[PDB]
Amino acid sequence: SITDYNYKKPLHNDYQILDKSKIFGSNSGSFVMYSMAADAYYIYNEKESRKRYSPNSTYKIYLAMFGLDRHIINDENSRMSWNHKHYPFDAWNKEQDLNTAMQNSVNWYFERISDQIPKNYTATQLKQLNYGNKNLGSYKSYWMEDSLKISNLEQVIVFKNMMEQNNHFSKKAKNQLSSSLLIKKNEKYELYGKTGTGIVNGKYNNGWFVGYVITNHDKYYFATHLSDGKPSGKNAELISEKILKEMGVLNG
Numbered sequence: 131s132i133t134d135y136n137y138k139k140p141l142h143n144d145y146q147i148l149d150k151s152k153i154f155g156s157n158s159g160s161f162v163m164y165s166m167a168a169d170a171y172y173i174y175n176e177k178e179s180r181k182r183y184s185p186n187s188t189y190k191i192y193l194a195m196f197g198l199d200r201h202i203i204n205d206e207n208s209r210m211s212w213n214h215k216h217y218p219f220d221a222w223n224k225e226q227d228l229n230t231a232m233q234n235s236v237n238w239y240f241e242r243i244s245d246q247i248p249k250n251y252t253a254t255q256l257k258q259l260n261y262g263n264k265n266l267g268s269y270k271s272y273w274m275e276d277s278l279k280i281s282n283l284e285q286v287i288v289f290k291n292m293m294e295q296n297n298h299f300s301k302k303a304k305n306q307l308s309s310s311l312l313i314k315k316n317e318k319y320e321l322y323g324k325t326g327t328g329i330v331n332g333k334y335n336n337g338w339f340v341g342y343v344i345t346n347h348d349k350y351y352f353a354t355h356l357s358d359g360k361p362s363g364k365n366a367e368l369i370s371e372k373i374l375k376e377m378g379v380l381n382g
């Protein structure tokens with residue numbers, strides 16, 4: 131409870147300090163990146179990077195993986211019919227597959243997955259993944275400004291480990307998840323990721339962008355968290371992309 135707001139485990143790694151305060155501007159937060167070739171971490175605002183926040187829609191990454199693992203969806207059929215409930219976003223008011231659900235951050239699709247996953251399986255997975263505080267609370271949308279929290283630094287460690295280590299998750303599930311996360315591809319790179327946005331009292335409280343980049347030469351996992359200013363998922367994405375471009379990760 132007391133420091134389940136904080137990730138205190140140190141890195142058995144090389145960790146390079148960054149200054150991206152100019153790109154963040156009047157936004158508060160942190161940026162973490164890991165290079166697979168260097169096996170090294172680059173961090174802006176290491177202090178903020180270890181403070182745990184609700185993952186919001188970034189957790190859909192994991193609900194997707196859990197849904198694939200448990201065969202709730204698969205590569206032949208990940209489609210789910212709209213139940214004819216009018217949401218205030220037209221992209222939600224229709225049938226979805228994993229790709230559209232992930233792209234448009236359709237809560238009801240991922241809530242429908244969560245509803246079919248037994249709590250004991252989720253507790254086991256968060257323990258094995260080392261996902262943040264692993265706090266499931268009431269087990270009702272626990273990832274949306276609720277009990278479950280994770281740090282920006284952990285967003286990178288946990289995602290990298292889940293994808294890159296040989297674990298109980300199949301390659302095909304990781305591949306289908308990856309496809310759902312692809313944002314941009316040109317001759318130089320592929321950019322994958324997921325936004326998250328928390329809203330408290332009609333105001334932005336918490337912005338995320340978690341993802342990875344494949345180039346010709348390397349693979350980088352990264353995440354941006356915004357705690358203040360204009361802390362939206364969209365804004366976290368723009369900041370991520372400016373930082374990655376500057377660092378030579380994104381060309382073209």
Ligand SMILES: *[B]([O])([O])[C]SC1=NC2=[C][C]=[C][C]=C2N1[C]C1=C(C(F)(F)F)[C]=C(C(F)(F)F)[C]=[C]1
Pocket residue numbers: 186187188219221222234235237325326327328329362363364
């Ligand atoms: B996840 O991205 O963190 C979920 S975002 C989310 N969930 C809800 C529930 C109720 C009301 C709003 C809401 N949002 C925000 C949202 C956004 C945006 F604010 F983040 F921009 C955008 C969209 C969409 F238009 F579809 F792209 C839907 C919801």
